[PDB]
Design a binder for this molecule. Structure first.
Ligand SMILES: [Mg+2]
Ligand SMILES: [Mg+2]
Ligand SMILES: [Mg+2]
Ligand SMILES: [Mg+2]
Ligand SMILES: [Mg+2]
Ligand SMILES: [Mg+2]
Ligand SMILES: [Mg+2]
Ligand SMILES: [Mg+2]
Ligand SMILES: [Mg+2]
Ligand SMILES: [Mg+2]
Ligand SMILES: [Mg+2]
Ligand SMILES: [Mg+2]
Ligand SMILES: [Mg+2]
Ligand SMILES: [Mg+2]
Ligand SMILES: [Mg+2]
Ligand SMILES: [Mg+2]
Ligand SMILES: [Mg+2]
Ligand SMILES: [Mg+2]
Ligand SMILES: [Mg+2]
Ligand SMILES: [Mg+2]
Ligand SMILES: [Mg+2]
Ligand SMILES: [Mg+2]
Ligand SMILES: [Mg+2]
Ligand SMILES: [Mg+2]
Ligand SMILES: [Mg+2]
Ligand SMILES: [Mg+2]
Ligand SMILES: [Mg+2]
Ligand SMILES: [Mg+2]
Ligand SMILES: [Mg+2]
Ligand SMILES: [Mg+2]
Ligand SMILES: [Mg+2]
Ligand SMILES: [Mg+2]
Ligand SMILES: [Mg+2]
Ligand SMILES: [Mg+2]
Ligand SMILES: [Mg+2]
Ligand SMILES: [Mg+2]
Ligand SMILES: [Mg+2]
Ligand SMILES: [Mg+2]
Ligand SMILES: [Mg+2]
Ligand SMILES: [Mg+2]
Ligand SMILES: [Mg+2]
Ligand SMILES: [Mg+2]
Ligand SMILES: [Mg+2]
Ligand SMILES: [Mg+2]
Ligand SMILES: [Mg+2]
Ligand SMILES: [Mg+2]
Ligand SMILES: [Mg+2]
Ligand SMILES: [Mg+2]
Ligand SMILES: [Mg+2]
Ligand SMILES: [Mg+2]
Ligand SMILES: [Mg+2]
Ligand SMILES: [Mg+2]
Ligand SMILES: [Mg+2]
Ligand SMILES: [Mg+2]
Ligand SMILES: [Mg+2]
Ligand SMILES: [Mg+2]
Ligand SMILES: [Mg+2]
Ligand SMILES: [Mg+2]
Ligand SMILES: [Mg+2]
Ligand SMILES: [Mg+2]
Ligand SMILES: [Mg+2]
Ligand SMILES: [Mg+2]
Ligand SMILES: [Mg+2]
Ligand SMILES: [Mg+2]
Ligand SMILES: [Mg+2]
Ligand SMILES: [Mg+2]
Ligand SMILES: [Mg+2]
Ligand SMILES: [Mg+2]
Ligand SMILES: [Mg+2]
Ligand SMILES: [Mg+2]
Ligand SMILES: [Mg+2]
Ligand SMILES: [Mg+2]
Ligand SMILES: [Mg+2]
Ligand SMILES: [Zn+2]
Lengths: 206, 155, 60, 97, 83, 23
RNA sequence: UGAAACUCAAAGGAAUUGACGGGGGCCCGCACAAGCGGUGGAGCAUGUGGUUUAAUUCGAAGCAACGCGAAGAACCUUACCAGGCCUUGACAUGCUAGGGAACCCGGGUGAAAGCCUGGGGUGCCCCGCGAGGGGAGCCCUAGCACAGGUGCUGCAUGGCCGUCGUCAGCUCGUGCCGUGAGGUGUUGGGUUAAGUCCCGCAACGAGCGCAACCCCCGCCGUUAGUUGCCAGCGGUUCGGCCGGGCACUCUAACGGGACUGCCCGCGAAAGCGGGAGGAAGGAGGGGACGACGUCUGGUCAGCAUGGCCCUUACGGCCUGGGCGACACACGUGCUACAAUGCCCACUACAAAGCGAUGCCACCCGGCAACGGGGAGCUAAUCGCAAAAAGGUGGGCCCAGUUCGGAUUGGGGUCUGCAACCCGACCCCAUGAAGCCGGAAUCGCUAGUAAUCGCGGAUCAGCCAUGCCGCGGUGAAUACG
């Protein structure tokens, strides 16, 4: 049990923080808590939409939440129905001026957290895990990625003996700083237990 | 080490006599990295040997060194089912290290109460050929000659 | 004895000594950082995600 | 002296004494047994008897396993002896040439 | 020990009962959990039962044991020796 | 040395002050 | 010459991939050697095995458990014990019915919790000049679903970590060889820190590792000049204090710089040896970074999670106790046994950090811990702050001592509701073992070891001699 988290390893090199602001010693914690609660609510509500990243900004008494997603419509609604509904649920929790944006995920099959969740969904549907993993990777490479690696660990297929299955294509140079690699994790709850899913997408090096 | 023959550290010549050998001796005196202390002790000793016997301390020191240098030593080697004490010539680098080491150690087995004094006197005896330092050298040599018969096991 | 404890830690006590930090994320009573409100494990978990502003792997 | 650990198990002074009489077989070799340490443990398959002992000529590390805690201990002893006998005699092998 | 600038600490709920018994004339047994309370001159001659975590230990207070704490006389560990 | 409170060195090691190490 | 009873589910041949060998060859690593300092002995601090206990919660187990989870156990924490209590319940989502909502304030009983109870005014959209009639803002009371469980299983698991190992390795595609496992490539010759690179080759490529891309440090430049700096000229209360300036130091962002690039030599090449230039030379020093996998490794007690188990209790609140016990045993550390030392007095030289119920100048009371005054600082401004070893002087004179500072008596301080169990600190007195440690055993190859102090997280306080950092002084040695 070894490998460093491929995102935290690239913060401020190939990858940027998800909560971008400044706060002083007396304040930092409380903002951070609210920040996570914002993610808590949205992670539940926006799941069906195809949630990939949740950026957060702050100045003074006002905050801007930018939601990246594969299905922008499922967020916005009919002419703004759910999009409006959100601000109210939002600024109730926030208790402050909570600007909610939405933005496209141009290629969900090049978004690692998306690929990960899809396979996790597939294996809660009792699909063939190995066949799935090869597929996921096949999708990501077709969509143009320079390399891909997907991993599933647990009681695979229901087996009593836990095992780890993975598949990979092209390059995935986890040791290279300047290599841009999107990473994502998805939890698959089954009747026999939890499976962990990890997706690595190598978009390219910078 | 395994790959290459390591590099002998070139020391910086001492401030008072301009001598790499003196510097080396100082460091051997030096406990806990207190080199100022170490420096004084030697130089204080250098003062003392001048008072007791009016000569060049440097000359005394260097003569004492050449007197404690073992020219031959025994190094064990287990050949077959027995450990033979094989007689070996000492490299000049090693002769120096052993000489300076024994000088300080024998010094610090002496009974007089101040280090500078012990360091002084031991350097005086070793210069004249007396003292535990030279005794060490004489012994090491005698062991080597005593086992001259095993000098063909030399590597 | 856990959820009752993450709860009892919230309510103000009978005496101010009895107050102690719990990790607001996982409820951990030990190795809780004041600055974040988080324990050493959560501190690491969020930081690796990049969800701690300005925080990054420190190397020198 | 000799230490015995019973990991996530309860044992008696009797059982502890038994182990001491069993390790005692190693006294045969007339060499110093330095801080012998026995760890008794229960797996689903049976018991496990671990031991680490140092001697002037090396360390002894052995693990014994068996449904019967005493047999597990006996096999531990058997593995320890074989090691101790090698430690004590391996040097004699190459006395010639 | 406790700052002299501050008080001589008795838990008030223990102390109150002492003075109550002093007035009417003492004494019934007093069960207390207040190990932290100082034996106080008003308490002398009483017998206070001090809970040690398990049992309430009957302690007859005397002139010698004034300055101390109540816990000091109801030991909390059973130790009869080894082997 | 460092273990004796009634000395300067002891109060340094311990990080306190007093008669034997005043400020 | 040659059975049988009985018994076993194999006995076997060859070959394959491993692993192992007291088989061989060639290599590497503080692995040995060479060194320097320790541990094992003492006293003490701390973890653990045991034993004790009402309980002394629980895990960790050779290396890779044992100053480990614990980056702060008096209450709290706390998961254990004893006792006193609560029953949709400390907490979620409900649906229903009574009360008034909502929020505050006291009284009784009690160790507290809890039980008992006496206070007092609910907006709304509403028939409201009127009793009166709600709805759901939130609580209360009675239900039923449900909560809650640090109860079990790390041998059902996710996650994250440890380890072998920063070791140089582990494989795939297609082709070729083999009936087949599987081989080849990846082996071989040279080379490298390296499956690094070169040459050769039924192999030709590719991937994960290696390296590089990132951070700190070392030289230089550019941009900046305060709260930082002061070379020079003025004042100079006698202090970069003032004028002034940003040169220098610095601070912190961006660049330059080293590539075996250049000469000699050996090389088939890759490279190696030597030289110059240069602050830096052959990865410049350190850091981050850990392949396929192994240990049915570790963690259900950080979290999540399958399943099994508890439901007026295996849930929940409180007071007290325990986690701090002590015939013993081991691990990690602190301080030592002294003169290269100890003590006093005076006097220099850091870095990185931290600081608004905080850091505290300076003043005064106290031998002191500390206390009372009181300025400054949202801090390159002000503060912690003094760094210590060192330096200069003076004392000690080889003694269980002016070494050592354990143990105990007495007196105080501070935190805290509260220091009996069970806090740290100060002062007076006491002044133990210990005269350099058996078998055995640990660390370190250079700004390293050793030695010296400073900071921080946790934190009311602290059992920190721990941990993570920071600079000061600064070695010995490596044949092999
Ligand atoms: Mg020496
Ligand atoms: Mg000698
Ligand atoms: Mg002679
Ligand atoms: Mg319980
Ligand atoms: Mg829980
Ligand atoms: Mg607290
Ligand atoms: Mg805490
Ligand atoms: Mg034992
Ligand atoms: Mg046990
Ligand atoms: Mg037992
Ligand atoms: Mg084992
Ligand atoms: Mg046998
Ligand atoms: Mg054998
Ligand atoms: Mg003393
Ligand atoms: Mg037959
Ligand atoms: Mg065979
Ligand atoms: Mg071999
Ligand atoms: Mg080593
Ligand atoms: Mg060695
Ligand atoms: Mg040694
Ligand atoms: Mg030490
Ligand atoms: Mg020792
Ligand atoms: Mg010891
Ligand atoms: Mg334990
Ligand atoms: Mg126990
Ligand atoms: Mg245990
Ligand atoms: Mg457990
Ligand atoms: Mg602690
Ligand atoms: Mg407690
Ligand atoms: Mg409690
Ligand atoms: Mg496991
Ligand atoms: Mg696991
Ligand atoms: Mg286990
Ligand atoms: Mg064949
Ligand atoms: Mg074929
Ligand atoms: Mg093959
Ligand atoms: Mg092939
Ligand atoms: Mg290979
Ligand atoms: Mg191969
Ligand atoms: Mg080769
Ligand atoms: Mg390497
Ligand atoms: Mg390569
Ligand atoms: Mg080849
Ligand atoms: Mg610098
Ligand atoms: Mg400039
Ligand atoms: Mg070179
Ligand atoms: Mg690398
Ligand atoms: Mg296991
Ligand atoms: Mg769990
Ligand atoms: Mg479970
Ligand atoms: Mg079922
Ligand atoms: Mg309690
Ligand atoms: Mg307690
Ligand atoms: Mg404990
Ligand atoms: Mg014992
Ligand atoms: Mg011992
Ligand atoms: Mg310690
Ligand atoms: Mg020790
Ligand atoms: Mg003596
Ligand atoms: Mg004495
Ligand atoms: Mg004695
Ligand atoms: Mg004395
Ligand atoms: Mg006292
Ligand atoms: Mg206490
Ligand atoms: Mg020693
Ligand atoms: Mg010593
Ligand atoms: Mg030995
Ligand atoms: Mg090294
Ligand atoms: Mg010292
Ligand atoms: Mg410190
Ligand atoms: Mg602090
Ligand atoms: Mg603290
Ligand atoms: Mg203590
Ligand atoms: Zn946490």
């Amino acid at each position: 049990g070894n490998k460093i988290h491929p995102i935290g390893f690239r913060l401020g090199i190939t990858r940027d923080w998800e909560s971008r602001w400044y706060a002083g010693k007396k304040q930092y914690r409380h903002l951070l808590l609210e920040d996570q609660r914002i993610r808590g609510l949205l992670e539940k509500e926006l799941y069906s939409a195809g949630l990939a990243r949740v950026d957060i900004e702050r100045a003074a008494d006002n905050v801007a939440v930018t939601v990246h997603v594969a299905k922008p419509g499922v967020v916005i609604g009919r002419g703004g129905e759910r999009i409006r509904v959100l601000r109210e649920e939002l600024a109730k929790l926030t208790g402050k001026n909570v600007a909610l944006n939405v933005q496209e995920v141009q290629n969900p099959n090049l978004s690692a957290p998306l690929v990960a969740q899809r396979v996790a969904e597939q294996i809660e549907r009792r699909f063939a895990v190995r066949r799935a993993i090869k597929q996921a990777v096949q999708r990501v490479m077709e969509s143009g990625a320079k390399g891909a690696k997907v991993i599933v660990s647990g009681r695979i297929g229901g087996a009593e003996q836990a095992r780890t299955e993975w598949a990979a294509q092209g390059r995935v140079p986890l040791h290279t700083l300047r290599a841009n690699i999107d990473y994502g994790f998805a939890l698959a709850r089954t009747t026999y237990g939890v499976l962990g899913v990890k997706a690595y997408i190598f978009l390219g090096e910078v | 080490a395994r790959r290459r023959r390591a590099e002998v550290r070139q020391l910086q010549p001492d401030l008072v006599y301009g001598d790499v050998l003196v510097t080396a001796f100082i460091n051997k005196i030096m406990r806990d990295g207190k080199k100022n202390l170490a420096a004084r002790i030697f130089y204080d000793a250098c003062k003392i040997i001048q008072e007791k016997t009016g000569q060049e301390p440097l000359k005394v020191f260097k003569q004492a060194v050449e007197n404690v240098k073992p020219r031959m030593e025994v190094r064990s080697r287990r050949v077959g089912g027995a450990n033979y004490q094989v007689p070996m010539e000492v490299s000049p680098r090693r002769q120096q290290s052993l000489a300076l080491r024994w000088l300080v150690q024998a010094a610090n087995q002496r009974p007089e109460r101040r280090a500078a004094v012990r360091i002084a006197h031991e350097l005086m005896d070793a210069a004249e050929g007396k003292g535990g330092a030279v005794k060490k050298k004489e012994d090491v040599e005698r062991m080597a000659e005593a086992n001259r018969a095993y000098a063909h096991y030399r590597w | 004895a856990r959820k009752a404890l993450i709860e009892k830690a919230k309510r103000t006590p009978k005496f101010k000594v009895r107050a102690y930090t719990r990790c607001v994320r996982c409820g951990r009573a030990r190795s809780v950082y004041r600055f974040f409100g988080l324990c050493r494990i959560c501190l690491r978990e969020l930081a690796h995600k990049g969800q701690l502003p300005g925080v990054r792997k420190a190397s020198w | 002296t000799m230490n015995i650990t019973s990991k996530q198990m309860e044992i008696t002074p009797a059982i502890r004494q038994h182990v001491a009489d069993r390790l005692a077989k190693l006294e045969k070799w007339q060499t110093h047994l330095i801080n012998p340490h026995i760890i008794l443990s229960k797996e689903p398959q049976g018991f496990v008897a671990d031991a680490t002992i140092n001697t002037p000529n090396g360390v002894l590390v052995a693990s014994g396993k068996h449904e019967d805690m005493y047999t597990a201990i006996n096999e531990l002893i058997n593995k320890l002896e074989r090691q101790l006998n090698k430690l004590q005699h391996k040097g004699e092998a190459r006395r010639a040439a | 020990p406790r700052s002299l600038k501050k008080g001589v600490f008795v838990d008030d709920h223990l102390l109150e009962k002492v003075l109550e018994l002093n007035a009417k004339g003492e004494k019934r047994l007093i069960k207390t959990w207040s190990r932290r309370s100082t034996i106080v001159p008003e308490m002398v001659g009483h017998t206070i039962a001090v809970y040690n975590g398990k049992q309430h230990v009957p302690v007859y207070i005397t002139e010698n044991m004034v300055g101390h704490k109540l816990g000091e006389f109801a030991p909390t560990r059973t130790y009869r020796g080894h082997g | 040395g460092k273990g004796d409170r009634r000395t300067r060195r002891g109060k340094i090691w311990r990080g306190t002050y007093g008669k034997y190490r005043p400020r």
